[PDB]
Amino acid sequence: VSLMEKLKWKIKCIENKFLNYRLTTNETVVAETEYGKVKGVKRLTVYDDSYYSFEGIPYAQPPVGELRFKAPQRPTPWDGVRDCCNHKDKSVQVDFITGKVCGSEDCLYLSVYTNNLNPETKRPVLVYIHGGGFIIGENHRDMYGPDYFIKKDVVLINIQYRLGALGFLSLNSEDLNVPGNAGLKDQVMALRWIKNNCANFGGNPDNITVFGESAGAASTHYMMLTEQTRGLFHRGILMSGNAICPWANTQCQHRAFTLAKLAGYKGEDNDKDVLEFLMKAKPQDLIKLEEKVLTLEERTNKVMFPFGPTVEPYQTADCVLPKHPREMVKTAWGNSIPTMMGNTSYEGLFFTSILKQMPLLVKELETCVNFVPSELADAERTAPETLEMGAKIKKAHVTGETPTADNFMDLCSHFYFWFPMHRLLQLRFNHTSGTPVYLYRFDFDSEDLINPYRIMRSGRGVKGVSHTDELTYFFWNQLAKRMPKESREYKTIERMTGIWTQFATTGNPYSNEIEGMENVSWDPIEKSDEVYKCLNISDELKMIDVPEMGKIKQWESMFEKHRDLF
C-alpha cells in the first residue's frame, strides 16, 4: 500500500482517536452477565444519536501458552465490576495499510451495543461476524461502528475470533489435540455466551440473527452447519459468501511443517516436534510468515490462504467440521431457519489491485483451466476433460478474441461467489423443511462515502460495486462522515439497516415502512424456480431476475457428466 495512503491512514487514525474521546460521555452503566458485572459507557454518533457500548467482554480464556492452537475454554468468572469501556486488541494479523504485524493473542472478546438498556419489550439480537479471509479483521469501532444500527431498536454484537495459523493450524496426530478450526470454535463459544446473556442487555434470546460478510459469510454459514450450535440462533444472512466457496475451506495439515521450517525449525516432519516448535515461537513471527507458506502449485490452483477452515482429521468433543461442507449441508439444522443471501453487482471488481501487480493472470482465461473447480480438474490442468470444462468457462466470460481484465474480474465474481451460491441453494433445496431463502443483489455505487477495503483493493476512482462496498452502509468507519438526510447515501443506510432489522425481527425482509419498497413483492426462492429472483438494490429497489443466471448455468454445465459432485 502506497506511502500516501499510509500517511493518510495515519492521520485518520489520529482523527478517529480524538473523535472517539469527544463522542464519549460520563454516563457509565452496569450490566449483569453470567460471568460477573460489566461496566459499559454511553457514546454519541455523528448523527446526534446515542448508544450504550460494552466492549472487551471475554467469552473465552485467553488462548495463550499451552492453549495456543487449541479449542477455546470458558473464561474465569469474577466478582466485582469489569471495565468494558474500552476495546481490546485484535487477533494477531498483518496490517494491510502498514504491512506490520499487529494485535495480540489475547483477542477473544465481543462487543455489545444498544440505544436502550431497559427496553419495554425484549429486542432482536443481531450478531456480526467480520470477514477478512480468516486472516485479518476486528470488532473495533473504527472499522465496525454500530452508529447506523443503533437508530433501530435492536441489540447489536460484534465478535472477534482467532485468525490465521493461530486460529486454524491443523495436525493429523490425534494425541496432540490440534484438530483444527480453533477460530470457528471461538465463534461457537461466543454464540453460547450470546444465547445465555443477551437478555441482560434487553435482547430476546429466542430471536437471534447471525450475519457476516466474505469470510464472515462463510463463518455464518459454518455456524448454520455445525451440530455444535443447533437451535442457538434463528435467522442467518450470508453476505457475499458461504462455506462451499472454494476459498472457504482447505486441507492444511501438511502446511504446519512448512510454516515451522520458515520460522527456523530444525528437525523432521513429525507433528509432535512441529507443534512444540510452533508453541514456543513468537506469535508475530508466525503471522508474518504465513504469506510464504503456499507453494506455487497451490497458488496456481487458486488456493488463497494457507490456513483456514478444514475437515478435522479426527472427532473431538468441540469438533466443528467433521465432514466436507457440502456433506454437512445435507444434515444442517441451519437449513430450516429463515435465510437471506446476496452478492454485490460486480464482486470480482475487487481484484483490480492484484491484477495490476500480476498482468499475466489475465492470460489464464485463454483456456480457463485454472478456474475449473478443483474437484473436477486434473493435477497439471492438462487433461482433455479439463480443457473442455475450461472451455465452458471461457465461453461464459470472454467477450472477444482476446480476454480482458474485465472478463477476468467478471469470472472471479462467479468463481468465488455466484457459483458457490448457486450450488448451495440447489443442495439446500434437497434437504430442507422449506423455510424461505431470500436473495438480494447490492447494486448501489457511491464514492462520497467509503470504507477502508477500498484502500486495499485500490478502489479509488473506480466505478462499479465491488465486494465489501456494502459494509459502508451498515457500519460506521473512521473514513466515514455525516451525510445529509436527503442524500442517496443516507437513504441507503436507512434502507439497508432497515431491511436487515426487518429480517432479523420477523424472518421476512419486506416492509412498506422502508422508503422505496412500495411496489416491491419480494418472494423467496422455490426449488421449482429455473431462474432466481432477487431484490436489486440501487437508487431504486426493484425485483428482478438474477442477471448472472445464464453464466451460473454455464458453470453448472461443467458437472454434466459429474452430477454427483454438484
HEC string of 51-118? EEEEEEEECCCCCCHHHCCCCCCCCCCCCCEEECCCCCCCECEECCCCCCEECECCCCEEEEEECCCC
Across 319-347, b (16+ Cβ under 10 Å) vs e yields bbbbeebbebbeebebbebbbbbbbbbbb
Tell me the residue type at 514: I
Cα separation values, 112 from 87, 106, 120, 197, 198, Å:
11, 18, 18, 11, 9
C-alpha cell, 427:
443442495
DSSP states of 421-473:
HHHHHHHHHTT-----EEEEEE----SSS--THHHHTT-TT--S--TTTTGGG
- Which H or E element spans position 545? strand 541-545
Burial of 173 (0-12, 13-18, 19+ CB in 10 A): middle
Which residues, in sequence order, are CB contacts of 525 under 8 Å at separation 6+? 425, 436, 437, 438, 439, 532, 533
| Residues 139 and 159 sit within 8 Å (Cβ to Cβ) | yes
Residue in 55, 105, 312, 347 annotated catalytic: 347
Is 521 a known active-site residue? no
155 phi and psi angles, rounded to 5 deg: -110, 125
Tell me the residue type at 198: C
Pairing of strands 541-545, 533-537: antiparallel
CA-nearest of 74, 75, 79 to 37 is 79
Q: How was this structure determined?
A: X-ray
Is 518 a known active-site residue? no
DSSP state of 482: P
Rounded to an integer, what distance in angstroms lies between the CA atom of residue 437 and that of residue 88?
36
C-alpha cell, 336:
430450516
Residue in 240, 312, 467, 470 annotated catalytic: 467
Rounded to an integer, what distance in angstroms lies between the CA atom of residue 501 and that of residue 520?
17
| Residues 63 and 70 sit within 8 Å (Cβ to Cβ) | yes
**What distance lies between CA 468 and its chain's CA centroid?**
10
Number of domains the chain contains: 1
Is 214 a known active-site residue? yes
Cα separation values, 451 from 10, 228, 414, Å:
15, 34, 24
DSSP state of 153: S
Cα separation values, 229 from 36, 320, 375, Å:
24, 9, 29
DSSP states of 324-381:
-HHHHHTT-GGGGS-EEEEEETTGGGGGHHHHHH-GGGGGGGGT-GGGS-TTTS-TTS
Helices 549-556 and 384-397: angle between axes, nearest 10 degrees: 180
Cα angle, residue 128 at apex, residues 432 and 34 outer, rounded to 5°: 100
| Residues 339 and 352 sit within 8 Å (Cβ to Cβ) | no
Is residue 44 classed as helix, strand or coil in its secondary structure? strand
| Residues 213 and 382 sit within 8 Å (Cβ to Cβ) | no
Cα angle, residue 120 at apex, residues 116 and 123 outer, rounded to 5°: 65
CATH number for 287: 3.40.50.1820
C-alpha cell, 566:
454438484
Rounded to an integer, what distance in angstroms lies between the CA atom of residue 545 and that of residue 538?
15
Residue in 111, 214, 413, 466 annotated catalytic: 214
C-alpha cell, 180:
483444527
**Residue 213 domain boundaries:** 1-566
Is residue 208 classed as helix, strand or coil in its secondary structure? strand
DSSP state of 414: I
Rounded to an integer, what distance in angstroms lies between the CA atom of residue 146 and that of residue 329?
32
